[PDB]
Design a protein around this nucleic acid. Structure first.
Ligand SMILES: [Mg+2]
Ligand SMILES: [Mg+2]
Ligand SMILES: [Mg+2]
Ligand SMILES: [Mg+2]
Ligand SMILES: [Mg+2]
Ligand SMILES: [Mg+2]
Ligand SMILES: [Mg+2]
Ligand SMILES: [Mg+2]
Ligand SMILES: [Mg+2]
Ligand SMILES: [Mg+2]
Ligand SMILES: [Mg+2]
Ligand SMILES: [Mg+2]
Ligand SMILES: [Mg+2]
Ligand SMILES: [Mg+2]
Ligand SMILES: [Mg+2]
Ligand SMILES: [Mg+2]
Ligand SMILES: [Mg+2]
Ligand SMILES: [Mg+2]
Ligand SMILES: [Mg+2]
Ligand SMILES: [Mg+2]
Ligand SMILES: [Mg+2]
Ligand SMILES: [Mg+2]
Ligand SMILES: [Mg+2]
Ligand SMILES: [Mg+2]
Ligand SMILES: [Mg+2]
Ligand SMILES: [Mg+2]
Ligand SMILES: [Mg+2]
Ligand SMILES: [Mg+2]
Ligand SMILES: [Mg+2]
Ligand SMILES: [Mg+2]
Lengths: 41, 201, 122, 176, 97, 88, 127, 211
RNA sequence: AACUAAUCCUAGCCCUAGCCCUACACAAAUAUAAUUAUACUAUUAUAUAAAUCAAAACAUUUAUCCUACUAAAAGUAUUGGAGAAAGAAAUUCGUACAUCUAGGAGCUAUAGAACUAGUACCGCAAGGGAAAGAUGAAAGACUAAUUAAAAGUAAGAACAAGCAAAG
RNA sequence: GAGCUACCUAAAAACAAUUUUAUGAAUCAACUCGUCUAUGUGGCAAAAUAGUGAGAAGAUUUUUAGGUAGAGGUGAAAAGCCU
RNA sequence: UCUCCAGGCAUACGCGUAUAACAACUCGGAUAACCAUUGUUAGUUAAUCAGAAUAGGCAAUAAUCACACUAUAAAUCACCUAUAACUUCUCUGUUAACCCAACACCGGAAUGCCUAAAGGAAAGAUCCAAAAAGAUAAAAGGAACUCGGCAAACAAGAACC
């Protein structure tokens, strides 16, 4: 694994920060959160 | 075993078995290699602590763990602990020594109490002796009590222990005869039969 | 479903399967299904008389151990054979043919105890 | 008698028993063959008593008193065995010139390896023994490919070991 | 994702060690030395790629050509299989015909 | 002494139908394995007499007990007549 | 003697003499109840019952009347941290019946022979 | 143990000096008593002089008093590192063991009467000096939660205690450290804990009956 | 005001360079149902690699596989259902770092060897084949800490109406 | 790879009672098989259970060891069986 | 002690300490108790039970209670002549609730003796629902059921393509 992405933490927080006021797993599960955030925008 | 770590507790003791189980895989300790010739610190040597909590304090070596390049001084570099603790009682507070690496101490010149660096050199008889780098002098090997607790001078033998004279008596007479032949002649056994031919292969 | 790693011993297998546990044979099974023990094949323990013997299991801690010098063929030869040959050479009564006089053994055959091939146990 | 399988009755129940040093090889070398023969049995009786005592402690779930005595006795018996072995080995060399008491040979097994073969005693010569002849001391041509594979397998192991030493030296010098 | 909870040890680099300080010296051995030696002769590496470059199929064939007769059985079998795979890839597969 | 499970038998030397249902004398030959000279070498000198006694007690109890059971006497119906036999 | 070659015997051969003995035995307390004459021994797997008779009579000067032996299988069930079976060694048990009416009983080794009204405050304080 | 365990202090007092009933008064006499027991104690002083050569009973009370004040003041800060130097390993657990998770405010008010050496002893070799101290002190201990459980925030109470100091004469780095306190039987009882206690009675199983 | 967890750095590995090797490292046991101290009963590789696959099928044919110095001559001469493809030599050049055991714009526990191990386990057998570890100078200082931090829960069930949000 | 299964070779074993023209006969156990139904359907079971049924001195059943191997073997042919 | 159930004990093959005691109460038993689990210590004892010299010559006549008989498928070293040897007990198996089925599997598993003298327990506690499964009983009727008397029956008989 010569080159592994090291910043994925902040890429994930980009989406989840917009989803924290949703209800359900939409607000914390990235695969679901990303779809919800795109509809909100 | 490669993953064994040498500690203050003697190898093979109950304490060591608890510390070094077969499944332990702790990170190796890195020790600067020192040849048997290179090492110059021995139990009973007075040494001075160059640095640390007790920097500048002279002490006497009492244990040497060569696998960690450790020298332990009695009553120095000492922290505090409770010995003999049980559920009912706290135990007794004691001061416990910690190991000091070789480079953190220096040997002490006997006549003048100072941390003199030493060099290994032979003598007239040929015996290897430590000599001080400055103020060239013979620092004799100190005498330390035997680890097992046996003092040879005070030792008085009981039954089943050979006396000195008996052990050192010479009875061997060199001859071209095996122990088997010697015993038969001594014990008077007579055997005139001989083994038949056997083929080795 | 069999165990491949455990040792094959006589406890395992059918009754027909039998094998020894390493004991030396002491006799012969003749015809008619008869065991005949041989007295010579049975080891005999040569035990000395220990009366008056001064050596005991342990030694004084004050007894000095000596410098280790394992015995060599040369060391044995000098102690035993050299003085005789040296004395005979000065007297001149020495010849190659009579090395047996000083203790040489031309062959091991006919000896009860043969050094090679060894024919006695420890 | 059977009393010799146990310690002195006074010593029974004592937490420790005082014992001297074990026999060293050089001290034994001074002794004669006859004396070593007697000394062997003296140690043997002591060894049996300690082995007897060791087992009884396990049954009673107690510590064995002065367990170092057992190691000392075993060390003494090895030295007696060594000294007797040395004397026999020297005498064999002088009279026969052979370095081993047992005949043997260097042979190639069916797997393509070189192994020292220890000879056995038989009552008949080798060419008349049908069990012996069934044993094969040669390898057929299908083994050469395996012979090379072992050499290459071994060469990889040696290469890794040498590399790892060089890596470990880097850590030492970097650390110191 | 999970992240380190501590800073790793700082990296210490000596920029003036002998290897870094003298890097490049004698790269003009030819033009400044009357062309007795070509600079490629200063390259240290595998025997089959000193002063040479090529694609992976070329490198595999070149290694076999140079040291194929001194290779271990496992290695040579793997190298030969790699050649046949690369041969089929470069000569039959791809977007551009 | 070792155990096995097989047919239980009570036999006097002949079946119950035989008129001669009582015993007079038994003759036993000690096996060579148990003879005097071997026993002395094995160091069990005191067993020379013991070998004879064990053979008598076992053999004669078996015979007389089998005779008694031929007459209908068993553990719960003990013998009314003493049953006698002798052996050399 | 164990771990050694014995000279092969053929008709007319000498007697086999072992001058130094390699067999080591230990007297063990019977697990079960045994007759007074019987004594238990744990012996090397290569020792025969004939060997034990000569061993005891000659080395220890004890008269023996009969010897029986059995080979006890050692457990192979326990496993180590790597799940590798641990083998307990197989051994041989010998039962020796003493002679001359002598009796033996295994000897008894190892014979033997703050204040509740101010709690939580150190008493050291004298105030 | 391959290495002998090292002890720089010995638990207990070699000879427990018995204070004289009524000694707590006039806050000579006891000065004479050490002179009177010179055979038992002056010999100990003579031995202490050999290894020390600067041991003078006249000046020890001032130094001995100084150690006592400083040692207790470590309790307020909870500077165990300092306190180890001031007190012996025997004294340390007694002072500090039950003060864990507690805060103690201790101050020393003016001493009522001059401190005096009263009894010394010697045993490789240890020398113990008993000193008599009469002083007014303040103490207040608190909970985890800051609630007061013992003592009065600030009032001075006169205390008479006998404190034993000790030194390891052989060691070059030995020093005089507070070792123990001898309590007289005639001493009045100490102040009680503020709270109230329940002392449970015997617990009985159904089989048993109360007696 | 936290559970489940998370963080870690070295065990070793990879590729080269250099270099033939000569290690073949107690006693005893083993080719008998291996590891069973002795006779019974004799002991011994293989004739050409094939196919898959490519030729958009397939049927002659299909580089490496099936090795004999680099670079050039040259993808040339030649060979080929003259299709797919295959493919020289003559002849020129080359003293290779040399010295001693070195090097890494290689991996860092799902990586790098399958490997802590050809073990555990699975298979009658040939064979297949894992997983994981982390205190400190000292444990002869009671085993270390560090982190609103994953999903999942708890602290704290819910309250007409609806892709669950947006204004 | 024939410790399952197919067939074979060698050495062995089991078959009560009741009738009979005296037997690949009859009735019916042990034993072998598996007709029909219900249950079960991640089951007790990767084919069983519970009943009901077929044969049961024979081309019977069963045990131990050996044999035949995939371009093959075996097959009272179901293209069935060969872990 | 009581109530009830009715394949048990040996050997072979296989298994390999699951045997027994103590101590533990993490893991294992699909839950407890208790241990089949963990640790330690012990164990299975044999001359009768079981396993493990050579060269020649030579044979018509089953078994079945072997007699009478009948049968057909045609069916088990010895003895003799010579030679050689001229007193021996070592070695190995022996425990168990156990083996093959991934399991403490309603399955598979050979022989001898016996059929309860041996070996065992269908219900953790409570409740008395529906549906589902199994057993018994049925007023009047008696195949009107159903593709079909499938299944069940106080029946288990007859006959034909
Ligand atoms: Mg094609
Ligand atoms: Mg097609
Ligand atoms: Mg095709
Ligand atoms: Mg073709
Ligand atoms: Mg890995
Ligand atoms: Mg892996
Ligand atoms: Mg969360
Ligand atoms: Mg709404
Ligand atoms: Mg078969
Ligand atoms: Mg019948
Ligand atoms: Mg019929
Ligand atoms: Mg029928
Ligand atoms: Mg019919
Ligand atoms: Mg058929
Ligand atoms: Mg058909
Ligand atoms: Mg068809
Ligand atoms: Mg219990
Ligand atoms: Mg459970
Ligand atoms: Mg049990
Ligand atoms: Mg258990
Ligand atoms: Mg036996
Ligand atoms: Mg049994
Ligand atoms: Mg199953
Ligand atoms: Mg019963
Ligand atoms: Mg119920
Ligand atoms: Mg009904
Ligand atoms: Mg009705
Ligand atoms: Mg109808
Ligand atoms: Mg209708
Ligand atoms: Mg019906």
């Amino acid at each position: 694994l010569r080159n592994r992405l090291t910043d994925r933490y902040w890429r994930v927080q980009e989406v989840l920060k917009h989803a924290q006021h949703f209800r359900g797993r939409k607000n914390r599960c990235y695969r679901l959160a990303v779809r919800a955030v795109t509809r909100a925008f | 075993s490669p993953f064994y770590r040498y500690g203050m507790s003697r190898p093979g003791s109950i304490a060591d078995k608890r510390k070094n189980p077969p499944w332990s895989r702790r990170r190796p300790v890195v020790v600067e290699p020192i040849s048997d010739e290179d090492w110059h610190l021995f139990c009973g040597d007075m040494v001075e602590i160059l640095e640390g909590k007790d920097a500048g304090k002279q002490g006497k070596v009492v244990q040497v763990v060569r696998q960690r390049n450790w020298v332990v001084l009695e009553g120095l570099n000492t922290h505090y602990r409770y010995i003999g603790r049980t559920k009912d009682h706290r135990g007794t507070m004691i001061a416990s020594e910690a190991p000091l690496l070789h480079h953190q101490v220096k040997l002490v010149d006997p006549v003048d109490r100072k941390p003199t660096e030493i060099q290994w050199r032979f003598t007239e008889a040929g015996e290897r002796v430590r000599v001080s780098t400055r103020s060239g002098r013979i620092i004799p090997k100190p005498e330390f009590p035997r680890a097992d607790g046996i003092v040879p001078e005070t030792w008085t033998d009981g039954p089943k222990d050979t006396s000195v004279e008996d052990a050192l008596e010479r009875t061997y007479v060199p001859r071209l005869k095996t122990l088997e032949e010697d015993v038969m002649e001594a014990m008077g056994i007579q055997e005139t039969r001989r083994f038949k031919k056997v083929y080795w292969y | 479903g069999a165990d491949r790693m455990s040792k094959w011993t006589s406890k395992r297998g059918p009754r027909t399967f039998t094998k020894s546990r390493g004991a030396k044979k002491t006799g012969i099974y003749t015809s008619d299904r008869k065991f005949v023990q041989i007295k010579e094949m049975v080891p005999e323990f040569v035990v000395p008389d220990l009366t008056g013997f001064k050596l005991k299991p342990y030694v004084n801690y004050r007894a000095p151990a000596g410098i280790d010098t394992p015995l060599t063929a040369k060391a044995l030869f000098q102690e035993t054979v050299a003085p005789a040959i040296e004395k005979d050479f000065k007297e001149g009564t020495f010849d190659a043919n009579n090395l047996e006089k000083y203790g040489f053994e031309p062959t091991q055959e006919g000896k009860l105890f043969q050094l090679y091939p060894k024919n006695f146990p420890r | 008698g059977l009393e010799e399988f146990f310690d002195d009755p006074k010593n029974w129940g004592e937490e420790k028993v005082k014992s001297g040093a074990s026999w060293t090889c050089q001290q034994l070398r001074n002794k004669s063959n006859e004396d070593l023969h007697k000394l062997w049995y003296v140690l043997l009786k002591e060894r049996n008593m300690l082995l007897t005592l060791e087992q009884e402690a396990k049954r009673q779930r107690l510590p064995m008193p002065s367990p170092e005595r057992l190691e000392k006795v075993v060390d003494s018996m090895d030295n007696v065995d060594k000294v007797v072995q040395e004397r026999e080995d020297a005498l064999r060399l002088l009279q026969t010139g052979q370095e081993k008491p047992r005949p043997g040979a260097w042979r190639r097994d069916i797997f393509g390896r070189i192994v020292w073969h220890k000879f056995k005693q038989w009552p008949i010569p080798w060419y008349l023994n049908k069990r012996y002849n069934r044993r094969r001391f040669f390898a057929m041509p299908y083994v050469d490919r395996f012979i090379r594979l072992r050499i290459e397998k071994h060469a990889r192991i040696e290469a890794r070991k040498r590399s790892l030493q060089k890596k470990k030296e880097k850590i030492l010098h970097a650390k110191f | 994702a999970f992240v380190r909870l501590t800073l790793p040890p700082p990296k210490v680099v000596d920029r003036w060690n002998e290897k870094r300080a003298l890097f490049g010296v004698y790269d003009n051995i030819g033009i400044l030395g009357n062309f007795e030696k070509h600079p490629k002769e200063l390259i240290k590496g595998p025997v089959w790629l000193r002063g040479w470059r090529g694609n992976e199929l070329q490198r595999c064939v070149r290694k076999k050509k140079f040291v194929g007769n001194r290779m271990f059985i496992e290695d040579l079998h793997n190298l030969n299989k790699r050649i046949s795979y690369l041969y089929k890839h470069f000569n039959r597969h791809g977007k551009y015909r | 002494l070792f155990r096995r499970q097989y047919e239980n038998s009570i036999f006097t030397g002949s079946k119950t139908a035989d008129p001669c249902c009582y015993g007079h004398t038994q003759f036993h030959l000690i096996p060579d394995r148990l003879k005097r000279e071997r026993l002395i070498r094995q160091n069990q000198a005191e067993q020379v007499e013991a070998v004879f006694r064990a053979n008598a007690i076992a053999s004669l109890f078996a015979w007389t007990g089998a005779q008694a059971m031929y007459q209908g006497f068993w553990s719960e119906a003990d013998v009314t007549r003493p049953f006698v036999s002798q052996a050399v | 003697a164990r771990n050694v070659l014995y000279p092969l015997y053929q008709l007319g051969g000498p007697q086999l003499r072992v001058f130094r003995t390699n067999f080591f035995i230990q007297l063990v307390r019977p697990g079960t109840a045994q007759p007074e004459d019987t004594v238990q021994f744990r012996i090397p797997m290569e020792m025969t019952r004939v060997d034990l008779r000569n061993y005891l009579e000659q080395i220890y000067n004890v008269p023996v009347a009969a010897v029986r032996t059995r080979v006890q299988h050692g457990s192979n069930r326990r496993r180590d941290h790597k799940n590798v079976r641990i083998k307990k060694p197989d051994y041989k048990v010998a039962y020796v019946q003493l002679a001359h009416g002598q009796t033996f009983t295994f000897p008894d080794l190892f014979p033997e022979k703050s204040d509740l009204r101010c709690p939580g405050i150190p008493s050291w304080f004298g105030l | 143990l391959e290495r002998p365990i090292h002890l720089a202090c010995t638990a207990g007092i070699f000879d427990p000096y018995v204070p004289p009933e009524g000694d707590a008064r006039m806050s000579l006499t006891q000065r004479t008593e050490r002179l009177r027991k010179n055979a038992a104690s002056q010999l100990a002083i003579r031995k202490i002089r050999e290894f020390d050569a600067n041991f003078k009973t006249k000046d020890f009370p001032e130094k001995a008093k100084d150690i006592f004040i400083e040692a207790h003041l470590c309790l307020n800060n909870s500077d165990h590192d300092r306190l180890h130097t001031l007190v012996t390993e025997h004294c340390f657990p007694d002072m500090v063991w039950d003060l864990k998770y507690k805060t103690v405010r201790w101050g020393f008010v003016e001493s009522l009467e001059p401190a005096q050496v009263v009894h010394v002893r010697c045993s490789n070799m240890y020398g113990q000096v008993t000193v008599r101290l009469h002083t007014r002190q303040t103490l207040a201990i608190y909970d985890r939660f800051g609630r007061l459980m013992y003592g009065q925030e600030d009032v001075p109470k006169d205390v008479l205690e006998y404190v034993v100091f000790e030194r390891h004469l052989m060691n070059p780095y030995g020093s005089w450290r507070m070792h123990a306190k001898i309590v007289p039987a005639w001493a009045p009882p100490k102040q009680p804990i503020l709270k109230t206690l329940m002392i449970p009675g015997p617990q009985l199983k159904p089989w048993e009956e109360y007696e």
